[PDB]
Protein backbone atom coordinates (compact mmCIF):
# COMPACT_ATOMS: atom_id res chain seq x y z
CA UNK A 1 0.00 0.00 0.00
CA UNK A 2 2.07 2.87 -1.36
CA UNK A 3 1.60 6.20 0.41
CA UNK A 4 -0.64 8.68 -1.39
CA UNK A 5 -1.73 11.17 1.31
CA UNK A 6 -0.03 13.57 3.67
CA UNK A 7 -0.95 14.87 7.11
CA UNK A 8 1.63 17.61 6.70
CA UNK A 9 0.96 20.25 9.38
CA UNK A 10 0.58 23.89 8.58
CA UNK A 11 1.46 26.60 11.14
CA UNK A 12 4.62 24.82 12.23
CA UNK A 13 6.68 27.57 13.89
CA UNK A 14 9.98 28.63 12.45
CA UNK A 15 13.26 27.91 14.23
CA UNK A 16 13.62 31.40 15.70
CA UNK A 17 10.23 31.14 17.43
CA UNK A 18 10.15 27.39 18.14
CA UNK A 19 9.82 26.80 21.84
CA UNK A 20 10.39 23.37 23.43
CA UNK A 21 7.61 21.26 24.96
CA UNK A 22 8.66 17.59 24.53
CA UNK A 23 11.29 15.58 26.36
CA UNK A 24 13.14 15.04 23.11
CA UNK A 25 13.06 18.80 22.67
CA UNK A 26 14.56 19.52 26.08
CA UNK A 27 17.19 16.84 25.45
CA UNK A 28 18.25 18.25 22.13
CA UNK A 29 18.26 21.72 23.66
CA UNK A 30 20.63 20.50 26.35
CA UNK A 31 22.97 18.85 23.86
CA UNK A 32 22.95 21.98 21.73
CA UNK A 33 23.58 24.13 24.77
CA UNK A 34 26.59 22.05 25.74
CA UNK A 35 28.02 22.08 22.24
CA UNK A 36 27.59 25.81 22.12
CA UNK A 37 29.11 26.17 25.58
CA UNK A 38 32.13 24.43 24.15
CA UNK A 39 32.15 26.62 21.07
CA UNK A 40 31.96 29.75 23.22
CA UNK A 41 34.41 28.99 25.99
CA UNK A 42 37.06 27.98 23.47
CA UNK A 43 37.24 30.55 20.66
CA UNK A 44 40.54 30.13 18.80
CA UNK A 45 41.28 32.44 15.85
CA UNK A 46 44.06 31.95 13.37
CA UNK A 47 47.07 34.28 13.25
CA UNK A 48 46.34 35.09 9.61
CA UNK A 49 44.40 38.17 8.56
CA UNK A 50 46.19 40.36 11.10
CA UNK A 51 48.20 42.48 8.70
CA UNK A 52 47.34 46.15 9.23
CA UNK A 53 45.85 47.37 12.51
CA UNK A 54 47.29 44.46 14.45
CA UNK A 55 48.09 46.78 17.36
CA UNK A 56 44.51 47.03 18.52
CA UNK A 57 44.09 43.29 18.28
CA UNK A 58 47.27 42.74 20.28
CA UNK A 59 45.90 45.07 22.90
CA UNK A 60 43.02 42.62 23.36
CA UNK A 61 45.70 40.06 24.19
CA UNK A 62 47.15 42.49 26.72
CA UNK A 63 46.59 42.67 30.47
CA UNK A 64 43.84 45.28 30.78
CA UNK A 65 41.75 43.42 28.21
CA UNK A 66 42.73 39.77 28.42
CA UNK A 67 41.15 37.70 25.69
CA UNK A 68 42.53 34.50 27.17
CA UNK A 69 40.16 34.97 30.10
CA UNK A 70 37.37 34.15 27.65
CA UNK A 71 39.34 31.19 26.33
CA UNK A 72 40.66 32.97 23.26
CA UNK A 73 43.95 31.66 21.90
CA UNK A 74 45.55 32.71 18.65
CA UNK A 75 46.95 29.83 16.62
CA UNK A 76 49.56 29.72 13.91
CA UNK A 77 47.62 27.21 11.84
CA UNK A 78 44.10 27.06 10.37
CA UNK A 79 43.65 23.37 10.84
CA UNK A 80 43.34 23.73 14.62
CA UNK A 81 41.33 26.97 14.43
CA UNK A 82 37.73 27.97 13.97
CA UNK A 83 37.69 31.75 13.52
CA UNK A 84 39.29 34.12 11.05
CA UNK A 85 39.82 37.80 11.72
CA UNK A 86 40.29 39.83 8.54
CA UNK A 87 41.90 42.89 10.03
CA UNK A 88 43.61 45.48 7.93
CA UNK A 89 43.55 46.07 4.20
CA UNK A 90 42.64 43.06 2.08
CA UNK A 91 44.67 43.72 -1.05
CA UNK A 92 44.31 42.02 -4.41
CA UNK A 93 47.77 40.46 -4.05
CA UNK A 94 46.59 38.74 -0.86
CA UNK A 95 42.99 37.66 -1.41
CA UNK A 96 43.87 34.23 -2.85
CA UNK A 97 46.04 33.50 0.18
CA UNK A 98 43.09 34.47 2.34
CA UNK A 99 40.75 32.14 0.55
CA UNK A 100 43.26 29.32 0.88
CA UNK A 101 43.44 29.84 4.62
CA UNK A 102 39.67 29.99 4.81
CA UNK A 103 39.08 26.80 2.87
CA UNK A 104 41.74 25.07 4.95
CA UNK A 105 39.81 25.71 8.15
CA UNK A 106 37.69 22.78 9.35
CA UNK A 107 33.99 23.36 9.72
CA UNK A 108 32.36 24.88 11.84
CA UNK A 109 33.98 28.12 10.89
CA UNK A 110 33.08 31.76 11.29
CA UNK A 111 34.49 35.05 10.13
CA UNK A 112 34.63 38.41 11.86
CA UNK A 113 35.72 41.53 10.05
CA UNK A 114 37.72 43.91 12.20
CA UNK A 115 37.99 47.46 10.93
CA UNK A 116 36.72 49.61 8.11
CA UNK A 117 39.44 48.75 5.66
CA UNK A 118 38.19 45.16 5.72
CA UNK A 119 34.45 45.79 5.83
CA UNK A 120 34.09 48.17 2.88
CA UNK A 121 37.62 49.15 2.09
CA UNK A 122 37.43 52.21 4.22
CA UNK A 123 39.93 54.82 3.50
CA UNK A 124 41.43 53.06 0.48
CA UNK A 125 38.10 52.20 -1.10
CA UNK A 126 38.90 53.89 -4.37
CA UNK A 127 42.43 52.50 -4.72
CA UNK A 128 43.70 50.27 -7.49
CA UNK A 129 45.20 47.73 -5.09
CA UNK A 130 42.28 46.98 -2.79
CA UNK A 131 39.34 44.67 -2.43
CA UNK A 132 36.40 46.90 -1.59
CA UNK A 133 35.25 44.60 1.16
CA UNK A 134 36.24 41.17 2.36
CA UNK A 135 32.69 40.07 1.61
CA UNK A 136 33.78 39.72 -2.00
CA UNK A 137 36.07 36.84 -1.03
CA UNK A 138 34.79 35.22 2.17
CA UNK A 139 31.48 35.09 4.03
CA UNK A 140 31.38 37.35 7.04
CA UNK A 141 29.29 36.82 10.17
CA UNK A 142 30.15 39.93 12.23
CA UNK A 143 31.37 43.37 11.19
CA UNK A 144 33.24 45.39 13.80
CA UNK A 145 33.18 49.10 12.92
CA UNK A 146 36.10 51.40 13.48
CA UNK A 147 39.52 52.42 12.23
CA UNK A 148 41.17 51.06 14.35
CA UNK A 149 38.35 49.54 16.33
CA UNK A 150 38.78 49.91 20.04
CA UNK A 151 39.70 46.81 22.01
CA UNK A 152 36.33 47.11 23.65
CA UNK A 153 34.67 47.04 20.23
CA UNK A 154 36.45 43.80 19.45
CA UNK A 155 35.44 42.22 22.70
CA UNK A 156 31.85 43.33 22.14
CA UNK A 157 31.97 41.85 18.68
CA UNK A 158 33.16 38.58 20.10
CA UNK A 159 30.29 38.76 22.58
CA UNK A 160 27.92 39.18 19.64
CA UNK A 161 29.48 36.19 17.92
CA UNK A 162 29.21 34.06 21.03
CA UNK A 163 25.55 35.03 21.04
CA UNK A 164 25.17 33.93 17.44
CA UNK A 165 26.62 30.53 18.17
CA UNK A 166 24.63 30.31 21.41
CA UNK A 167 21.34 30.75 19.56
CA UNK A 168 22.46 28.12 17.03
CA UNK A 169 20.61 24.86 16.39
CA UNK A 170 22.80 21.82 15.79
CA UNK A 171 20.54 18.89 16.73
CA UNK A 172 17.19 20.64 16.95
CA UNK A 173 17.43 21.41 13.26
CA UNK A 174 18.09 17.76 12.56
CA UNK A 175 15.00 16.95 14.58
CA UNK A 176 13.23 19.31 12.20
CA UNK A 177 14.97 18.08 9.01
Amino acid sequence: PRVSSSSMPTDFPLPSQQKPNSAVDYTLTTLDAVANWARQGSFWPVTFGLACCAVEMMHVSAPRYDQDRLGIIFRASPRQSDIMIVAGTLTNKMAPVLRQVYDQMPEPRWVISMGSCANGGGYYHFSYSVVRGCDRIVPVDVYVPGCPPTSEALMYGVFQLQRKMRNTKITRMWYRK
Binding site: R64, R69, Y156, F159, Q160, R163, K164, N167
Partner: protein
Protein backbone atom coordinates in the same frame (compact mmCIF):
# COMPACT_ATOMS: atom_id res chain seq x y z
CA UNK B 1 44.47 42.94 44.88
CA UNK B 2 43.59 39.36 43.81
CA UNK B 3 43.85 38.20 47.45
CA UNK B 4 41.36 35.87 49.10
CA UNK B 5 40.66 38.21 52.01
CA UNK B 6 39.12 40.59 49.49
CA UNK B 7 36.54 38.12 48.25
CA UNK B 8 35.81 36.90 51.76
CA UNK B 9 35.22 40.37 53.17
CA UNK B 10 33.19 41.28 50.12
CA UNK B 11 30.99 38.23 50.51
CA UNK B 12 30.47 39.19 54.13
CA UNK B 13 29.51 42.68 52.97
CA UNK B 14 27.08 41.67 50.22
CA UNK B 15 25.09 38.56 50.96
CA UNK B 16 25.38 35.11 49.44
CA UNK B 17 22.58 35.67 46.94
CA UNK B 18 24.52 38.53 45.44
CA UNK B 19 27.62 36.37 45.67
CA UNK B 20 26.21 33.62 43.48
CA UNK B 21 24.78 36.26 41.17
CA UNK B 22 28.14 37.97 40.84
CA UNK B 23 29.86 34.63 40.37
CA UNK B 24 27.41 33.71 37.63
CA UNK B 25 27.71 37.09 35.90
CA UNK B 26 31.03 38.87 36.49
CA UNK B 27 33.29 36.04 37.59
CA UNK B 28 34.52 38.20 40.50
CA UNK B 29 33.04 39.28 43.82
CA UNK B 30 32.59 43.02 44.21
CA UNK B 31 30.83 45.12 46.83
CA UNK B 32 30.01 48.80 46.75
CA UNK B 33 27.40 51.44 47.24
CA UNK B 34 24.53 51.91 44.84
CA UNK B 35 24.49 55.06 42.73
CA UNK B 36 21.26 54.41 40.85
CA UNK B 37 19.41 52.47 38.20
CA UNK B 38 18.63 53.34 34.60
CA UNK B 39 15.45 53.03 32.51
CA UNK B 40 16.25 49.47 31.41
CA UNK B 41 16.69 48.37 35.03
CA UNK B 42 20.50 48.15 35.15
CA UNK B 43 22.09 49.03 38.48
CA UNK B 44 25.38 50.88 38.82
CA UNK B 45 27.70 50.77 41.81
CA UNK B 46 30.91 52.38 43.05
CA UNK B 47 33.67 51.20 45.39
CA UNK B 48 36.01 53.04 47.73
CA UNK B 49 38.30 50.25 48.98
CA UNK B 50 42.04 50.62 48.51
CA UNK B 51 42.29 47.12 47.07
CA UNK B 52 40.56 48.09 43.83
CA UNK B 53 42.93 49.49 41.21
CA UNK B 54 42.16 52.24 38.74
CA UNK B 55 39.38 51.38 36.27
CA UNK B 56 37.71 48.94 38.69
CA UNK B 57 35.97 51.39 41.03
CA UNK B 58 32.70 51.53 39.09
CA UNK B 59 30.79 48.52 37.88
CA UNK B 60 27.44 47.34 36.56
CA UNK B 61 24.94 44.66 37.45
CA UNK B 62 22.78 43.90 34.45
CA UNK B 63 19.16 42.85 34.73
CA UNK B 64 18.81 40.42 31.85
CA UNK B 65 20.61 37.10 31.79
CA UNK B 66 21.51 37.81 28.15
CA UNK B 67 23.52 40.87 29.08
CA UNK B 68 25.01 43.17 26.46
CA UNK B 69 26.65 46.57 26.96
CA UNK B 70 24.20 48.04 24.46
CA UNK B 71 21.60 47.60 27.18
CA UNK B 72 23.30 50.35 29.19
CA UNK B 73 21.42 53.62 28.91
CA UNK B 74 23.32 56.76 27.89
CA UNK B 75 24.81 58.88 30.61
CA UNK B 76 25.76 55.74 32.42
CA UNK B 77 27.79 54.61 29.39
CA UNK B 78 29.87 57.76 30.00
CA UNK B 79 29.98 57.66 33.78
CA UNK B 80 30.84 54.01 33.38
CA UNK B 81 34.03 54.89 31.68
CA UNK B 82 35.16 57.66 34.00
CA UNK B 83 34.11 60.39 31.64
CA UNK B 84 32.46 62.23 34.51
CA UNK B 85 32.41 62.11 38.29
CA UNK B 86 28.68 62.88 38.56
CA UNK B 87 26.04 60.45 37.50
CA UNK B 88 22.89 61.27 35.51
CA UNK B 89 20.94 60.56 38.66
CA UNK B 90 22.71 63.45 40.47
CA UNK B 91 23.70 65.70 37.58
CA UNK B 92 21.93 69.06 38.03
CA UNK B 93 18.97 70.26 35.98
CA UNK B 94 20.49 72.86 33.68
CA UNK B 95 23.06 70.34 32.54
CA UNK B 96 20.24 68.03 31.34
CA UNK B 97 19.30 68.39 27.66
CA UNK B 98 15.81 69.64 27.01
CA UNK B 99 13.61 67.39 24.90
CA UNK B 100 10.55 68.38 22.92
CA UNK B 101 10.08 64.67 22.12
CA UNK B 102 9.65 61.54 24.26
CA UNK B 103 12.54 59.29 25.15
CA UNK B 104 12.69 55.74 23.86
CA UNK B 105 15.81 53.63 24.38
CA UNK B 106 16.40 50.80 21.93
CA UNK B 107 19.51 48.58 22.02
CA UNK B 108 21.53 47.04 19.22
CA UNK B 109 18.94 44.65 17.80
CA UNK B 110 21.46 43.07 15.42
CA UNK B 111 20.89 39.44 14.63
CA UNK B 112 17.17 39.88 15.31
CA UNK B 113 14.25 41.05 13.18
CA UNK B 114 14.47 44.54 14.57
CA UNK B 115 17.83 45.13 12.96
CA UNK B 116 17.96 48.46 11.18
CA UNK B 117 16.90 48.29 7.56
CA UNK B 118 18.35 50.98 5.35
CA UNK B 119 16.48 52.65 2.54
CA UNK B 120 16.52 55.70 0.32
CA UNK B 121 14.72 58.71 1.74
CA UNK B 122 14.61 60.08 -1.82
CA UNK B 123 12.57 59.10 -4.84
CA UNK B 124 13.97 58.57 -8.35
CA UNK B 125 15.47 61.77 -9.64
CA UNK B 126 14.07 61.34 -13.16
CA UNK B 127 10.31 61.07 -12.94
CA UNK B 128 8.76 59.38 -15.93
CA UNK B 129 5.46 60.06 -17.66
CA UNK B 130 2.16 58.39 -16.88
CA UNK B 131 0.52 57.70 -20.24
CA UNK B 132 -2.71 59.28 -21.40
CA UNK B 133 -4.09 59.07 -24.92
CA UNK B 134 -5.83 61.43 -27.32
CA UNK B 135 -7.91 60.86 -30.44
CA UNK B 136 -7.36 62.34 -33.89
CA UNK B 137 -10.43 64.49 -34.13
Amino acid sequence: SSSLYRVLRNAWEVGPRSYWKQLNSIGDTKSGRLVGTDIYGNKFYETDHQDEIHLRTRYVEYKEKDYDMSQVEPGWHFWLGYGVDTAPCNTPKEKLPIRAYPYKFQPNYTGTPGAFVTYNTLKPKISAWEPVTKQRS
